[model samples]
Target: GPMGSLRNVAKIVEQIDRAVYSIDLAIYTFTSLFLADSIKRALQRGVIIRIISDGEMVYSKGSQISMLAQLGVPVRVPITLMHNKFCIIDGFERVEEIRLLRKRPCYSIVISGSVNWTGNWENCIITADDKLTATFQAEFQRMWRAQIQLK
Candidate 1:
């Protein structure tokens, strides 16, 4: 499916750069090499990146996790399922995951009348007319500041 293509990686990379304040991530598996590299690049660009993964993704000495931390990316592994997939770009806009399932190649959903920029890859843009953006913003902030063990 064209939906899963990583060309969206560039859009994500672009959004990651526009983040003037912070970038937050919660993943079950952080294995996307391309995305991971973008994260490192963001840190180098002075973007404050924070992550909360499963305890299994420990910062082994000199590993990607540790390397990122050393590069000034603050990270933590929370107790709950940090399963949320989204990016709160610039505080006002949050690009989130509704589902991995797609209908056709390059086709996406665009919610008109809202202020959000949700879409598939680089092909479309949606306005979040409802209260979705506010809800997601709260969730991201909650995870970002909540208490969690560092071990």
Candidate 2:
């Protein structure tokens, strides 16, 4: 199976390091500064970053989401018990890169599953199948901004 590992933090950071344009994350519980440091470095390298997390968990002991916000990466805690532990990387741009080259080897990816950014165990699915990644990007945007739906 393509499901990831029990110790996948390094793998997640590897995806962050490879990111060429953006990383939009929806996390449930955040605490690991090692992950925070990688996110910081990714931001410093000019990857556009945004985060949506669980409101209650933002104050959990060792939470580093505040530090990330202070450093200027946009962060949001939506009006939900959002439990998604996932992120979209280069979800918009990478497809264009591939589309230019016969829809070639360039990858737009989503990392998703039961693993919270805090813990050291559990598995994930690292996917590069275009429309799936696109759907995640859409959901991310929908949360990042508000809708004016009918009453």
Candidate 3:
């Protein structure tokens, strides 16, 4: 019952707007141009951004990978199917795009249930839990490193 109300997309957009260093995202399907624009802005500000998306989905209508690639952001579709919906900001803030969450220096947050960057959904918890943050970070890095450019 810790899950609360549907979260606004602005919340994640705000985080992206405030990010100072880097952004790593892995999503199953992407079609929200608003979120893509946010990422573009971050890139303009010198944010190190890397994205891994599903190969098939990238070819679908409305996918912004082409626009993002034109802007010079490094986007990968991996050799294998990649189906994750999470983003790590500045190596400290982790935004799990599905049932999203964020972890900081002194706190950790959890948004319960599945939700997208452009959709509505409920309940988020915030706490200062380093272990949880670390665990996710490690997984991010492993997957990040394992990514291969799809030919």
Candidate 4:
């Protein structure tokens, strides 16, 4: 796709490197060395990271997830369906009642779009809004805690 071509590997890696708190990934075709290396660096630096993927893609092929697994940073995939390409950085949290139902947290920087982690010749949307990024973050939290589900 034209979008993939618009993205550069080095630049994307830089962004990944910037995440010190956490990095949440949901990739359909999770393949890429540069990206993985950056994540590894993040892991070494103690960044809370998690990955989610479409079970079929990951289970079908010997995925990079396995490589990361050895480092104890692998994404425990589920048999459910997820073909979205998005990463929530730092993540956001909100509580209810006197705890403030409107309270919000976010990476304040979410990288998402038509690009899988596969590194393009891909396109993506780097959003830096608390509310919007929080939306995606909450969803990833759901996916993160999930083990498996059916079609």
Whole-model lDDT values for every prediction: 0.49, 0.73, 0.59, 0.66
lDDT of 2 at 122: 53
Which residue pairs does candidate 4 place in steric collision?
3-122, 3-123, 4-121, 4-122, 5-121, 92-105
Instruction: Tell me each candidate's RMSD, in Å, in order.
Output: 11.5, 6.4, 7.7, 5.7
- Local accuracy of candidate 3 as per-residue lDDT tens digits, 91-148: 5534333114322221332212243433333333322256655555566667767654
Off by over 4 Å in 3: 1-7, 81-84, 92-129, 147-151
Residue range 1-151, candidate 1, lDDT tens digits: 3464455655566556555544666544454456667778777765556765555544333235555656666666665443235554433433233222211111211211111111223332333333554555667667666655453
TM-score: which is higher, 2 or 4? 2
TM-score of each: 0.58, 0.78, 0.68, 0.75
**Model 2, stretches more than 4 Å misplaced?**
1-6, 93-106, 115-121, 147-151
The TM-score, computed over Cα atoms with residue i paired to residue i, of candidate 4 is 0.75
Which candidate achieves the best lDDT against the true structure?
2
Off by over 4 Å in 4: 1-6, 59-62, 81-83, 94-107, 115-118, 148-151
Model 4 poorest ten-residue lDDT run: 94-103
On the 0 to 100 scale, the lDDT of residue 74 in model 1 is 64
Best by TM-score: 2
**At residue 112, what lDDT does model 4 achieve?**
75
Q: lDDT tens digits, residues 8-46, model 4?
A: 556667778887567878777666667888999989887
Question: Per the 3 Å backbone cut-off, how many clashing residue pairs does candidate 2 have?
Answer: 0
